[PDB]
Design a protein around this nucleic acid. Structure first.
Ligand SMILES: OC[C@H]1O[C@@](CO)(O[C@H]2O[C@H](CO)[C@@H](O)[C@H](O)[C@H]2O)[C@@H](O)[C@@H]1O
Ligand SMILES: OC[C@H]1O[C@@](CO)(O[C@H]2O[C@H](CO)[C@@H](O)[C@H](O)[C@H]2O)[C@@H](O)[C@@H]1O
Ligand SMILES: [Mg+2]
Length: 580
DNA sequence: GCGATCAGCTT
DNA sequence: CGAGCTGATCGCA
């Protein structure tokens, strides 16, 4: 059973061949400034294991790592690249990434280790990472003989699996998606994460002190109105106070008790004064715990920066996710929460934050793919799409569109993009399922191309077994044939939504690639910091703002050519908050 | 400690 | 109605 390999004491020339499977192991989930516990190399000459303190101090090995002509095949090269960036070492020549390859082939597999990717091609001569390292409090790096064999086995699988993975990607017309989009993007994300975002901790600490004062006042007011002290953050104890002691109506229930959601509490406000205070307490408590305290926990004390990790291989649509901290959900909607963004500042003196976002990219992608004449014309005239939808579905002129009509047409537009269902829209607009169905019916009469696409896409998902995006990303939908109404409906909604949300993901990913290429051609010091689904956040010297005002929107607008134009809005300021 | 449940923040 | 991550509580060991 055991796999042969050389547990080397020093680096030799045969370990530096021009094609190899490479493993640079970082066990810690958060790889920023984290240890590299071991190194494995597999090539035409054999299998090798190197101790990191030895290999990373060897000039010939470091040079090999940074030589772009020396091709490497890896799994999660971004993790390795960043851990190496923290050590001052540049990783180049990664021509194949098994994690990204597995992800494009089928994102539903949830491949998060070499073993899971390998199982897709009936290769099982490698253990899962969790089996070797354990989990949670028991998580630990094993002794050298166990560690070394695991790393060599991982590199061996990568070496073996490259050909079959590339062959299937080619068959799926996804070879260019891997090589020209996801892999170059991986390198860009690595730079962004390493750069980090500077945080004004003193601003945060002062906001935290003001919130603590306001929480105390509201908290005591809640105990006064209830005539009793209890744990407000406990939906169980709160439910007793509201629905039993104060006798408030039960409009909705959960699986384990009474519902205390914001929308539920919103309806209970007129009955008792305690309701508005609990809502206010929930608002302040969310900012304090998640955005003040939670953010302060992950700020590096030396540099005052946050280094998020973008998961490029998780979502089923092709979007990225962000963790430790999640910087894709910083408050913006309410002013009190929006002020959290004042804490995100440029990393250098006399630099500014520049933010640029696509305007209605999802609805524009839908106009393109459905080839709906009305929707295409709307965007060609650059109309306010929600006002336009209201005019159409409610049969009125522009002057006759009221604020409530626009708000409801806006909801119909979101529903259409998310995969339309009468029950979901109804819940969202607080109306009946029958009334919501009336809006949908009206929409499809005004936008017959969109109705045709929605019908056709569901049919295609059933015929092929999957749906695809503009740049050939795919999502398998086996539940599209289920005889369970709920399970089948969800797959139908995903069939409708994925090519829209997914193609928008394709476009911004390409824009980021195109942008970095332009920033480098123009020798600008400007660099990407964050991506929030339809927007790009950068920082640059103040002297570069005027060039960016022209460069950034143009690159983002020209990323792809659709049947309708792409439109990008932009702003800049002293903090992320001011870039509005 | 572990994770199920509920709640809330974003696009 | 689509796609995510994280904090507090509570029942569990
Ligand atoms: O390095 C990110 C990359 O690693 C995976 C596992 O293959 O996720 C790991 O890292 C994440 C960020 O630290 C953690 O949230 C997660 O718990 C951990 O398994 C991939 O999913 C991801 O692409
Ligand atoms: O001060 C701690 C003590 O207060 C209680 C209620 O008297 O809970 C309150 O304080 C907690 C921590 O700040 C909050 O999570 C909670 O929402 C609030 O009601 C007790 O539960 C706690 O022992
Ligand atoms: Mg936008």
């Amino acid at each position: 059973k055991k796999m042969a390999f050389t547990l080397a004491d020093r680096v030799t020339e045969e370990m530096l061949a021009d094609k190899a499977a490479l493993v640079v192991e970082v066990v810690e989930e958060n790889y920023h400034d984290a240890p590299i516990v071991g190194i494995a190399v597999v090539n035409e000459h054999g299998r090798f294991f190197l101790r990191p303190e030895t290999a990373l101090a060897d000039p010939q090995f470091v040079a090999w790592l940074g030589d772009e002509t020396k091709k490497k095949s890896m799994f999660d090269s971004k993790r390795a690249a960043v851990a190496l960036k923290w050590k001052g070492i540049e990783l180049c020549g990664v021509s194949f990434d098994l994690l990204l390859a597995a992800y494009l082939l089928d994102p539903a597999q949830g491949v998060d280790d070499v073993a899971a990717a390998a199982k897709m091609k009936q290769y099982e001569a490698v253990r899962p990472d969790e089996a070797v390292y354990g989990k949670g409090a028991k998580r630990a790096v094993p002794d050298e003989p166990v560690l070394a064999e695991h790393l060599v086995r991982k590199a061996a699988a990568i070496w073996e699996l490259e050909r079959p993975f590339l062959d299937e990607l080619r068959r799926n017309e996804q070879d260019r998606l891997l090589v020209e989009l996801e892999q170059p993007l991986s390198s860009i994300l690595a730079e962004m994460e390493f750069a980090g975002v500077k945080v004004d901790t003193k601003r945060l600490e002062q906001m935290g002190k003001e919130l603590a004062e306001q929480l105390g006042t509201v908290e005591q007011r809640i105990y006064e109105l209830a005539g009793q002290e209890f744990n407000i953050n406990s939906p169980k104890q709160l439910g007793v106070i509201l629905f039993e002691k104060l006798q408030l109506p039960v409009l909705k229930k959960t699986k384990t008790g009474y519902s205390t959601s914001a929308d539920v509490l919103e309806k209970l406000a007129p009955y008792h004064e305690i309701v508005e205070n609990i809502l206010h307490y929930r608002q302040l408590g969310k900012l304090q715990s998640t955005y003040i305290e939670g953010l302060l926990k992950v700020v590096r004390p030396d540099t005052k920066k946050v280094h998020t990790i973008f998961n490029q291989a998780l979502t089923q649509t092709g979007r990225l996710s962000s963790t430790e901290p999640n910087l894709q959900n910083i408050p913006i909607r309410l002013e009190e929460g929006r002020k959290i963004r004042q804490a995100f500042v440029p990393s250098e003196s006399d630099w500014l934050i520049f933010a640029a976002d696509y305007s209605q990219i999802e609805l524009r992608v839908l106009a393109h793919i459905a080839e709906d004449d009305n929707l295409m014309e709307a965007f060609r005239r650059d109309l306010d799409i929600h006002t336009k939808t209201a005019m159409d579905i409610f049969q009125v002129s522009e002057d006759e569109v009221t604020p409530n009509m626009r708000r409801q047409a806006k909801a119909v537009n979101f529903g259409i993009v998310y995969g339309i269902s009468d029950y979901g829209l109804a819940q969202n607009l607080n109306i009946s399922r029958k009334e919501a169905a009336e809006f949908i019916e009206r929409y499809f009469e005004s936008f017959p191309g969109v109705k045709r696409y929605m019908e056709n896409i569901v049919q295609e998902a059933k015929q092929k077994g999957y749906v695809t995006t503009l740049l050939h990303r795919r999502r398998y939908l086996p539940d599209i044939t289920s005889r369970n109404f709920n399970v089948r409906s969800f797959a139908e909604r995903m069939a409708m939504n994925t090519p829209i949300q997914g193609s928008a993901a394709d476009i911004i990913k390409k824009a980021m690639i195109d942008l970095n290429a332009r920033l480098k051609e123009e020798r600008l010091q400007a660099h990407l910091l964050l991506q929030v689904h339809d927007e790009l956040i950068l920082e640059a010297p103040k002297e570069e703002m005027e060039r960016l005002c022209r460069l950034v929107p143009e690159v983002m607008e020209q990323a792809v050519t659709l049947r309708v134009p792409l439109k990008v809005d932009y702003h800049y300021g002293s903090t992320w908050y001011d870039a509005k």
